[PDB]
Design a protein around this ligand. Structure first.
Ligand SMILES: [Mn+2]
Length: 258
């Protein structure tokens, strides 16, 4: 029936409705650190989020998205392996039912407790919907989360989860600054890939940061309290909304560092 992360509609079934699931540039992947090639020609990333305008937070039944106003060049990403400017449209997370799993990308097969995705679209395309039809339409910044100390900048998000518990619920969410979610270092790995949920389009340049951010156990616990279901439907906790690693096939992972 419709896709999700259960036994009957989980990632292993997606190819029946979205054949691109078995495509040549699917994500996520395992990052083998010894085989990633250092590329001295890659430039430092440029993150400009000082003018970021968040608007709302929504439970879409598969994760929670914080959405931003992308009608102008307010929060953009440029540099790194990118040509042109990419505007932030939304961020969301993938997490596990246990601390030993939850991330989509893995590093030398290591899984983290969660993974944050900041989604950006190439402004040359004019809108998100046109950008997903292009090979260089999106740029996703992925950041791993490990359990340790609490992340202060994530608390405003944790606190509103109670109000968007079930599928379809949304809440006003203004003045949230995503700079509070960045690690200290911007060193990264990059490779050409796809969206990690249906429609699985191969329109993404992935930028995965080497340095994880720490969150407290209590912070991650509140994520696991969300529901996949809609209000008044039987309760299915929102946990393990991550796609396993896909074959690298003909792609090279490049590193901005050595
Ligand atoms: Mn994602």
């Amino acid at each position: 029936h419709h896709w999700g992360y259960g036994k009957h509609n989980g990632p292993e079934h997606w190819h029946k409705d979205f054949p691109i699931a078995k495509g040549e540039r699917q994500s996520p992947v395992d990052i083998d650190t010894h085989t990633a090639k250092y590329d001295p020609s890659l430039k430092p990333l440029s993150v400009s989020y000082d003018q970021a305008t968040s608007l709302r937070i929504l439970n879409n039944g598969h994760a929670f998205n914080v959405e931003f106003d992308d009608s102008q060049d307010k929060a953009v990403l440029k540099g790194g392996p990118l040509d042109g400017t990419y505007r932030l449209i939304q961020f969301h997370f993938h997490w596990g039912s246990l601390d030993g799993q939850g991330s989509e990308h893995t590093v030398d097969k290591k899984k983290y407790a969660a993974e944050l995705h900041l989604v950006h679209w190439n402004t040359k395309y004019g809108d998100f919907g046109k950008a997903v039809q292009q090979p260089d339409g999106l740029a996703v910044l992925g950041i791993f989360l490990k359990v340790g100390s609490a992340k202060p900048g994530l608390q405003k998000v944790v606190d509103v989860l109670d109000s968007i518990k079930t599928k379809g619920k949304s809440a006003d969410f203004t003045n949230f600054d995503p700079r509070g979610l960045l690690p200290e270092s911007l060193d990264y790995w990059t490779y050409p890939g796809s969206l990690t949920t249906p429609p699985l389009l191969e329109c993404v340049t992935w930028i995965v940061l080497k340095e994880p951010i720490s969150v407290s156990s209590e912070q991650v616990l509140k994520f696991r309290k969300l529901n996949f279901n809609g209000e008044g439907e039987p309760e299915e906790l929102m946990v393990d909304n991550w796609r396993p690693a896909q074959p690298l096939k003909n792609r090279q992972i490049k590193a901005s560092f050595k």
